[PDB]
Amino acid sequence: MPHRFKVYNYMSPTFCDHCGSLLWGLVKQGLKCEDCGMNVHHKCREKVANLC
Ligand SMILES: [Zn+2]
Ligand SMILES: [Zn+2]
């Protein structure tokens, strides 16, 4: 079943669960999955398997 990634405003340093690097930026720094909690960069969403 699919991740339901929604863009997210991270308020503490949070890292990408796919590539490990910081979700850089001030706002809108990546996407969180509603259902499993996975955090990804915009550039990393295509790279993650679509299995929630
Ligand atoms: Zn998920
Ligand atoms: Zn990443």
Side-chain angles (χ1 to χ4, degrees):
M1 292 199 189
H3 293 305
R4 296 193 150 82
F5 283 116
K6 288 215 225 183
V7 181
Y8 197 91
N9 299 308
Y10 295 89
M11 276 175 261
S12 84
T14 304
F15 294 184
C16 177
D17 291 323
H18 171 75
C19 78
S21 303
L22 180 68
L23 297 171
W24 311 282
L26 277 297
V27 305
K28 302 278 218 192
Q29 306 101 319
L31 294 84
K32 178 179 281 292
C33 177
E34 298 200 306
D35 291 303
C36 72
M38 186 195 192
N39 302 306
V40 300
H41 291 114
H42 298 275
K43 62 158 171 203
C44 290
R45 173 192 199 170
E46 271 295 85
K47 304 306 196 263
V48 306
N50 204 25
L51 183 64
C52 189

